[PDB]
Design a protein around this ligand. Structure first.
Ligand SMILES: O=C(CC1CCN(CC2CCCCC2)CC1)N1CCc2c(c(-c3ccc(C(F)(F)F)c(SCCN4CCC(F)CC4)c3)nn2CCCO)C1
Length: 219
């Protein structure tokens, strides 16, 4: 129930990444969510390897590397694999490569993941407050999304059908405009230092609360 949350202020969010020509936003959404749970448990902030997911969380998990994927099955791959490599050791190349997972460089683990009910922006607010950053999809197929520079994003022709993976690391209000605080993966030059504030409590705007999920690392 805090009116604003920003998980960057708790040291739980790594640097904004740059996906480039590879459609791996699902992998960035996944590692970003797990990175925060990693920080909470261990005190260490370490970027996790999106490339590991692109190359290894593939056909068994319904994913297609640079041609798309699910965050939930990415999570499941980490559970099945008993690990995910650090980004430093397995860095992002923005292309489809052979799986090169090496347990020697394991930087995190995943115990479970939770999916939130469709459209429930109230449940999403609670989870971001009481659990941490939440992986979500948004409908990003709008020039205005690409052109966004600052403020609370509102797109009248936006739909609830998601197509782009992002990370909800907070929420709040700017002079009564409620927004979601969203980490994108288009580098630092997009939006507000790589972030976009998207309208909140506007009937699941851009589908932000259509398919939320978040992972956990248990004791
Ligand atoms: O995660 C889940 C759970 C499902 C339920 C179980 N099945 C079974 C599956 C089949 C066998 C192998 C593994 C298990 C997969 C995960 N969702 C449930 C429904 C759902 C989700 C999304 C969703 C969520 C986030 C994003 C983001 F953020 F990336 F943009 C996108 S963009 C499209 C991603 N998509 C991934 C596969 C292919 F690359 C084509 C591209 C879509 N859309 N939809 C509706 C259409 C699909 O029903 C999230």
């Amino acid at each position: 129930l805090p009116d604003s949350v920003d998980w960057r202020e708790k040291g739980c969010v790594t640097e904004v990444k740059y996906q480039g020509s590879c459609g791996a936003s699902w992998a960035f959404s996944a590692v970003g969510a797990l990175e925060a749970q990693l920080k909470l448990k261990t005190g260490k902030l370490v970027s996790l390897s999106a490339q590991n997911l692109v190359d290894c969380s593939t056909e068994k998990y319904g994913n297609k590397g640079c041609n798309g994927g699910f965050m939930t099955t990415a999570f499941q791959y980490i559970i099945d694999n008993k690990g995910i490599d650090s980004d430093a050791s397995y860095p992002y190349k923005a292309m489809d490569q052979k799986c090169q997972y090496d347990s020697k460089y394991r930087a995190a683990t995943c115990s479970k993941y939770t999916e939130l009910p469709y459209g429930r922006e109230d449940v999403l607010k609670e989870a971001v407050a009481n659990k941490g950053p939440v992986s979500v999809g948004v409908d990003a197929r709008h020039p205005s999304f690409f052109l966004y520079r600052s403020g609370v994003y509102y797109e009248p022709s936006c739909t609830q059908n998601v197509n782009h993976g992002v990370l909800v690391v907070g929420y709040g209000d700017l002079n009564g405009k409620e927004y979601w605080l969203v980490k994108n993966s288009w580098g630092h030059n997009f939006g507000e230092e790589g972030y976009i504030r998207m309208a909140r409590n506007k009937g699941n705007h851009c589908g932000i609360a259509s398919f939320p999920s978040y992972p956990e690392i248990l004791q």
